[PDB]
Design a binder for these strands. Structure first.
Ligand SMILES: [Mg+2]
Ligand SMILES: [Mg+2]
Ligand SMILES: [Mg+2]
Ligand SMILES: [Mg+2]
Ligand SMILES: [Mg+2]
Ligand SMILES: [Mg+2]
Ligand SMILES: [Mg+2]
Ligand SMILES: [Mg+2]
Ligand SMILES: [Mg+2]
Ligand SMILES: [Mg+2]
Ligand SMILES: [Mg+2]
Ligand SMILES: [Mg+2]
Ligand SMILES: [Mg+2]
Ligand SMILES: [Mg+2]
Ligand SMILES: [Mg+2]
Ligand SMILES: [Mg+2]
Ligand SMILES: [Mg+2]
Ligand SMILES: [Mg+2]
Ligand SMILES: [Mg+2]
Ligand SMILES: [Mg+2]
Ligand SMILES: [Mg+2]
Ligand SMILES: [Mg+2]
Ligand SMILES: [Mg+2]
Ligand SMILES: [Mg+2]
Ligand SMILES: [Mg+2]
Ligand SMILES: [Mg+2]
Ligand SMILES: [Mg+2]
Ligand SMILES: [Mg+2]
Ligand SMILES: [Mg+2]
Ligand SMILES: [Mg+2]
Ligand SMILES: [Mg+2]
Ligand SMILES: [Mg+2]
Ligand SMILES: [Mg+2]
Ligand SMILES: [Mg+2]
Ligand SMILES: [Mg+2]
Ligand SMILES: [Zn+2]
Ligand SMILES: [Zn+2]
Lengths: 104, 85, 52, 50, 245, 81, 58
RNA sequence: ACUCGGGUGGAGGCCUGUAGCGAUGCUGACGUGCAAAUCGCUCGCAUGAUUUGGGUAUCGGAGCGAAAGACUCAUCGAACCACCU
RNA sequence: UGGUUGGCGUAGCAAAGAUCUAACGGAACGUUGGAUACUGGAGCGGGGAAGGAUUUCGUGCCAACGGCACUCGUACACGAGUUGUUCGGAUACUGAGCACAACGUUACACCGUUUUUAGGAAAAGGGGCAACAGAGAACCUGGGAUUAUAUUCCAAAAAGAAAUUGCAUG
RNA sequence: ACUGCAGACCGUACUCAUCACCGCAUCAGGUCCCCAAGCAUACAAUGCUCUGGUACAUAGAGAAAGGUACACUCAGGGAAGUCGGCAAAAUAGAUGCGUAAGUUCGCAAGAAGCAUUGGCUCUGAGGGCAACAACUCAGAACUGCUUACGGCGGGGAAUCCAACUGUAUAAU
RNA sequence: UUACCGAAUCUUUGAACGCAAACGGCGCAUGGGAGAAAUCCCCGUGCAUGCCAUAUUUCUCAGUGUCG
RNA sequence: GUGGAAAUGCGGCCAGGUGACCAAUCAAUCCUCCCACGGUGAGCUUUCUUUUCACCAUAAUCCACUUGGGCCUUUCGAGUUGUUCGGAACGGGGGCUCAAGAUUGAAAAAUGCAGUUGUGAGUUCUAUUAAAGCAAAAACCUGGGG
């Protein structure tokens, strides 16, 4: 069993990964291995971490995914880690409370 | 394992000459040493490109010197700003 | 190829391919999109819908 | 390889059906001069580099 | 003869700066009204390495003065400019590291970086790593402060000129020996086709004024005139003295 | 190895056929023709090579319309109503 | 069919429908190495490709 | 005071050596050749200033060169084409 | 410039190990069987790019060509052959880059910047191009489907099973 | 959800190489990518083998001199040969020992230098999961040698030069 | 059939000009066509830039230009 | 819109993310290979051979649902082959979630094949030098706000 490419492209680049596959017909057949992307992340300046409620959908299928598959139902849900939201909810509240005090 | 004398420089073998290794060795170690973080109180800084020091603890990035987190020149400026305060 | 499991749905649902198996009897309902199948273990109820 | 603009395929197509022996009946005309095709091409010799 | 390599670098063909991976110009914020009558707080977002450059560049994110949008902006970082730091650019910015405040308002004797010579030009002096310039005088009556350029060189500039506070980061690059011919291969990978530097005496008589001859030697003084035409102005140019000092 | 062994090193094309002249003179990398000077509007034409001016001048082709307008000038553009 | 080389598939369906009065379930054309375009049009099962081709003088 | 064992780890324009890139020697074969520069064995580098496809940029009183006047389509101490001639 | 010549039936056709056998074919090297080796998975393997562009396939042919021979051929002649919603490409990315426009310069645009002293929106920074190895990218197998194409062909039990885009429909 | 209709353009054969490209050629040269078995072995070295491919490189007879060789062998001597150890031979794997000057303390170093190694029948060691799995190392007898594949460094002492790796006159 | 010439026909391009272009690619607008459960598909015509004229029922505008 | 104490589950502009970027290694599957077993076919068969060889296949798509990481919660050790880590929350119990993966099944035995699993190995894919820090962008996504 030696295999050859089936899609018109023939280079071992990262976007052209292939999977060897024994078939029902007992052929051994290369198949395109999907170009998996890492999923949604909290922003790079906030340490760039993978989000919890969100799937690493390729945008090729992200359009067809349910909205909540790419988010949590929290404010900034598809954008920020829960701690990052809570950092703000505190920082919004506490900073305004000092400003409200600087009028006195 | 340990070299009698040249440590990180041991990788260079018998070349580049003794002094230049001696002088590369100081910068080479402070460069890969973990430098103290005033933010965390933690040894934590590690360089990630010349003049860039990521903090392993809290995500953060001091600017800093090339082979060292702080230049001796910088020691002056910070207090000198503190005194102007 | 989704597989409808309960009968109530399947009786609701073009030309259908019955397939007897040893220890089975599938009912492969073809449709515009999916080939729905309804597995049916004991035969006493297999022709119970086959004769439908 | 596979790649061809159709414009190149039309040209090799052109030269391909142009690559034919003269019709037998053309030689039988009065005052005929032609015998062999003087513009027969062979892929292993002249190149139509397109 | 034939065109000298000093002259060919002026075609700037092969000899252009690389910079595909360069982040863009590293400048100060546009001299807004806010700079001229207050201050703009921008938080530093991330300190980058610009390839081919020694100093890290910072990514201060100022909010846009006139519209709802936020304006990330890139300037070579003063040392000690950590991410999340809130920079304060403007005339009545507080005097601290990373703050960009009018040069005539910076205290005499304090050291500044990324100084701008012309007002509003967005920071041209003291930008290389480790570099800075002490303010050595103000002249409030004529509104022109002096300062000492990173080269031992005094210069007068208007106090309306901005400067950043502190040494530029990444200082001490040059102290580390390069050792390998390959190590200097990469510092110039991100710079330009500057390197390796073939000696002109090693070149031919067509190639260089110094080139050619049996023993490889310059035949005439290496100290060329200022008025020497290009292709001739090689060797030591308009040198006032030669020799080790 | 500047001879037959470096003839194997040469793999590309400098020129593909031109959209105008049909010459294999279209420098694909400098998208222009060495022959017609295409895409430049005015076609390439030098007096130091009249063997080439002659080679591609009018009458070299069908003169598809020019035959029609020549016949007409000869016939005073005589016309049916 | 050799079919006009500039014609596309949908036009070849509409043309079979009009010339030979028959539906084409599909029409996958190729252009021949020679430069002619060649359609393999498959008829709907309701239309025989045999009864029609012989009606066509073939 | 920070040294002596032992392991760990996998560094290096590190070593031996494939592939690949070269090309020292035999001044071997060939030398109207397989070849208008090749063949053989030997040999050198082979984690790097490496090799390599595609693309792109820079050329003729010019380009490009870790510099041999090297290379710039078998053409270079000034390509090739046409022309003056 | 054409033709011819001696040398001369000479120098050679000595790199990579290899053929043997029978039967048949044929006017006389092929074909099959057997034997024997070789390649030896960085292959005289199976697919592609560039390049080539009919070389493919079948039948015939073997005049010429295949530096010996051919019954055979990548040769010759004739007839065939390449099938896609999903492969690749374009539609539809940007990149080193390029350059239309404008503007400027030039005796002259065949130059330069690449935005334009600049009113670039037609319902803040003009238009475009530039990657078949980068980004993007909805399809799979089985076939008894060819002389030659198949992730392309298959027919109503679509061998079948999908995903997907547009519109529309309950 | 469903269903209905529709899903357009061009590529698509073959080649990709000691006969399909470039080299005036079916030219021993050159030419990017992918898949890549078994055994020995450290192995993509090398040898060999199933599969897939080949049997195409003009053949025959016989075996003058002189040649070419990716062929050997040579008594005694052992570089006397020669300009020159050129070429050849030689070293060789692994293990255990042992390893000098000099040194930038990294090295030099595989320094150098001895030594053991097959076969066979055994032993020992080294783990997993609960309440069977390796395959290396080690040892021991017995026994064998014609020292018997392939592959695999010759070494040392000094002087000159250049520090080093690198580049570089394609074709002296 | 020949000769000539009025009517036409004159495909893709090309100054090439709707935008591109190793793409027989892609538009916007207009009319047509086929067709079809509209979407798709074919077709015609217009659609480059510059400049001059004109807005003949005198187009819409811009200027801290001049005034009113 | 909505469940959940929480991690989170289900149902114009603006900012962020995907695109998006590393040798190796480790691990899982993949694949190939080997072995054991069992079947089936073939072959050897002077002798010997419970034997040698071959084969024993499982596509995308979908549906139900162990390893590595992140996190929630609750009441010096932890950790890797390895250069770590911990009150800025380690470990333990329960939970969440991502990424692979397993198995259940639909496809799908009406196919393949020809007259079976499991087990081992390899392959596969998912720090260092650095004065080197190792593309962009459309598309798309999610949010904040409306
Ligand atoms: Mg071509
Ligand atoms: Mg010289
Ligand atoms: Mg000179
Ligand atoms: Mg000197
Ligand atoms: Mg000198
Ligand atoms: Mg040359
Ligand atoms: Mg080249
Ligand atoms: Mg097609
Ligand atoms: Mg090395
Ligand atoms: Mg060596
Ligand atoms: Mg010289
Ligand atoms: Mg002879
Ligand atoms: Mg063999
Ligand atoms: Mg043939
Ligand atoms: Mg022919
Ligand atoms: Mg660009
Ligand atoms: Mg493009
Ligand atoms: Mg791609
Ligand atoms: Mg595609
Ligand atoms: Mg085929
Ligand atoms: Mg093919
Ligand atoms: Mg190949
Ligand atoms: Mg040729
Ligand atoms: Mg091997
Ligand atoms: Mg080998
Ligand atoms: Mg002897
Ligand atoms: Mg001697
Ligand atoms: Mg002697
Ligand atoms: Mg003598
Ligand atoms: Mg020798
Ligand atoms: Mg010693
Ligand atoms: Mg040297
Ligand atoms: Mg040479
Ligand atoms: Mg046009
Ligand atoms: Mg499956
Ligand atoms: Zn810190
Ligand atoms: Zn042209």
């Amino acid at each position: 069993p030696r295999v050859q490419y089936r899609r018109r492209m023939h280079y071992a680049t990262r976007g052209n990964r292939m999977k060897l596959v024994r078939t029902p017909g007992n052929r051994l057949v290369m198949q395109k291995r999907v170009k998996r992307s890492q999923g949604p992340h909290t922003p790079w300046v906030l340490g760039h971490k993978r989000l919890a409620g969100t799937k690493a959908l390729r945008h090729t299928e992200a359009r067809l995914a349910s909205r909540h598959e790419k988010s949590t139902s929290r404010p900034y849900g598809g954008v920020l880690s829960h701690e990052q939201v809570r950092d703000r909810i505190v920082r919004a509240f506490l900073i305004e409370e000092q400003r409200i005090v600087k009028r006195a | 394992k340990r070299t009698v004398k040249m440590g990180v420089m041991g990788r260079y073998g018998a070349r580049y000459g003794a002094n230049p290794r001696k002088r590369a060795k100081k910068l080479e170690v402070s460069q890969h040493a973990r430098h103290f973080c005033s933010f965390c109180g933690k040894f934590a800084f590690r360089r990630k490109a010349v003049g860039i020091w990521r903090c392993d603890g809290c995500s953060k990035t001091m600017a800093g010197g090339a082979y060292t987190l702080s230049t001796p020149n910088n020691s002056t400026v910070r207090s000198t700003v503190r005194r102007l305060r | 190829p989704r597989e409808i499991k309960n009968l109530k749905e399947f009786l609701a649902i073009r030309c259908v391919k019955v397939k007897h198996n040893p220890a089975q009897t599938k009912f492969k309902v073809r449709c515009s999109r999916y080939l729905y199948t309804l597995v049916v273990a004991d035969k006493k109820k297999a022709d119970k819908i086959e004769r439908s | 390889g596979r790649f061809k603009p159709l414009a190149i395929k039309k040209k090799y197509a052109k030269k391909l059906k142009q690559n034919r022996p003269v019709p037998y009946w053309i030689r039988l005309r009065t005052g005929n001069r032609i015998k062999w095709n003087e513009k027969r091409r062979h892929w292993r010799r002249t190149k139509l580099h397109y | 003869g034939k065109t000298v390599l000093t002259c060919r670098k002026g075609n700037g063909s092969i000899y252009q700066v690389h910079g595909h991976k360069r982040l863009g110009p590293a400048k100060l914020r546009i001299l807004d009204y806010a700079e001229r009558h207050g201050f703009m707080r921008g938080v530093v977002k991330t300190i980058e390495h610009e390839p081919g450059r020694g100093a890290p560049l910072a990514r201060v994110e100022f909010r846009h003065p006139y519209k709802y949008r936020r304006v990330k902006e890139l300037m070579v970082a003063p040392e000690g400019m950590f991410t999340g730091q809130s920079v304060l650019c403007g005339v009545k910015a507080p005097l601290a590291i990373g703050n960009v405040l009018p040069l005539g308002q910076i205290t005499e004797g304090c050291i500044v970086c990324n100084v701008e010579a012309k007002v509003g030009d967005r920071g041209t002096i003291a930008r290389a790593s480790g570099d800075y310039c002490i303010i050595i005088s103000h002249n409030h009556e004529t509104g022109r402060t002096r300062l000492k350029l990173p080269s031992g060189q005094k210069k007068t500039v208007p106090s309306n000129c901005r400067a950043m506070i502190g040494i530029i980061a990444g200082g001490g690059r040059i102290e580390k020996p390069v050792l390998k011919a390959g190590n200097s291969f990469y510092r110039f990978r991100g710079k330009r086709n500057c390197w390796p530097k073939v000696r002109g005496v090693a070149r031919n008589p067509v190639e260089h004024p110094h080139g050619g001859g049996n023993h490889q030697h310059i035949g005439h003084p290496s100290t060329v005139s200022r008025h020497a035409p290009p292709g001739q102005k090689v060797g030591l140019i308009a040198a006032r003295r030669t020799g080790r000092i | 190895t500047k001879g037959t062994t470096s003839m194997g090193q040469r793999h590309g094309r400098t020129h593909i056929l031109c959209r105008r002249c049909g010459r294999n003179a279209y420098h694909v990398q400098w998208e222009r023709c060495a022959a017609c000077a295409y895409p430049r509007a005015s076609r390439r034409r030098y007096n130091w090579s009249v063997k080439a001016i002659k080679r591609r001048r009018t009458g070299t082709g069908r003169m598809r319309y020019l035959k029609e307008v020549n016949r007409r000038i000869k016939n005073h553009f005589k016309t049916s109503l | 069919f050799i079919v006009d080389s500039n014609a596309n598939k949908t036009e070849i369906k509409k043309a079979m429908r009009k010339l030979y009065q028959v539906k084409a379930v599909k029409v996958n054309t190729l252009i021949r190495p020679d430069g002619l375009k060649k359609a393999y049009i498959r008829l709907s099962a309701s239309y025989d490709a045999l009864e029609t081709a012989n009606k066509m003088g073939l």
